């Protein structure tokens, strides 16, 4: 079930961790759209945010790294 | 260009800020874009996708001038000499 269309956010943020941690699998892979039901544009902005936060070492590439 | 550049350029050739559609102001805008953009390709050799837009603007300017040629030669010549257009 979707969240962004329900809450009516205009732009989704990349600094906050709580929202986008829900949309990653345990292994660091981004969850596909069809699993979660989020709309396509918001999924695209999600992925943009995942890369943007992952650059800053706020979110891991994959769970292999210690 | 930019909003202030367009706002200042429309008045130099058009009417009381509401016309912005005449042939004179149109050719002024296109020629401003061409004169500004020629410095881009002076360095970026490999680009060929914006060249299509450049040639489209040049063709539009040429078509406008050929229309003005039949329409009124006096304003045609005044525009070309005051803008610096060879023909």
């Amino acid at each position: 079930f979707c969240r962004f269309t329900a809450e009516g956010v205009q732009e989704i943020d990349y600094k906050d961790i709580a929202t986008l941690k829900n949309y990653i699998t345990e292994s660091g892979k981004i969850v596909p759209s069809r699993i979660t039901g989020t709309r396509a544009k918001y999924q695209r902005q999600l992925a943009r945010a995942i890369k943007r936060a992952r650059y800053l070492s706020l979110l891991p590439y994959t769970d292999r790294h210690q | 260009l930019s909003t202030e550049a367009t706002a200042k350029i429309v008045s130099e050739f058009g009417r009381d800020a509401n016309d912005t559609g005449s042939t004179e102001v149109q050719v002024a805008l296109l020629t401003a874009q061409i004169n500004h953009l020629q410095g881009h390709f002076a360095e970026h050799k490999k680009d060929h996708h914006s060249r299509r837009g450049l040639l489209r603007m040049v063709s539009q300017r040429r078509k406008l001038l050929d229309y003005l040629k039949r329409k009124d030669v006096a304003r045609y010549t005044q525009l070309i000499e005051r803008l610096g257009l060879r023909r």
């Binding site: 732009e11 943020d13 600094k15 906050d16 961790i17 709580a18 943007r52 650059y55 800053l56 070492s57 706020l58 979110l59 891991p60 590439y61 790294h65 | -």
Partner: protein
């Protein structure tokens, strides 16, 4: 002149003059009438994955409206000085100012 978002990252033993970095950088931005909308200090923080065999480093964030020349001067200063390990620069569509969720 347009909006920008900037963060950078500081080596732990070099943290003692981080106020110096903030002072110098803010002076640089205001040197050309540049307007700062937000400054945050996140303190010492753990890393998701190590950088330069380092498990922790210092965090600083700011959000400014400033001209291109000052943005380049900043980015050159960060790439030249080794005291910063990573940097980020963005554009924004509007002058966002409200509270960041990172400290909420």
């Amino acid at each position: 002149m347009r909006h920008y978002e900037i963060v950078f990252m500081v080596h732990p033993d070099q943290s003692e003059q981080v106020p110096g970095m903030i002072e110098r950088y803010t002076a640089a931005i205001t040197g050309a009438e540049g307007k700062i909308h937000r400054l945050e200090d996140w303190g010492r923080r753990q890393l998701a994955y190590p950088i330069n065999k380092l498990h922790k480093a210092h965090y600083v964030l700011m959000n400014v409206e400033a001209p291109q020349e000052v943005i380049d001067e900043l980015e050159t200063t960060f790439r030249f000085n080794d005291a910063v390990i990573r940097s980020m620069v963005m554009r924004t569509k509007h002058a966002v100012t409200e509270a960041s969720p990172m400290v909420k």
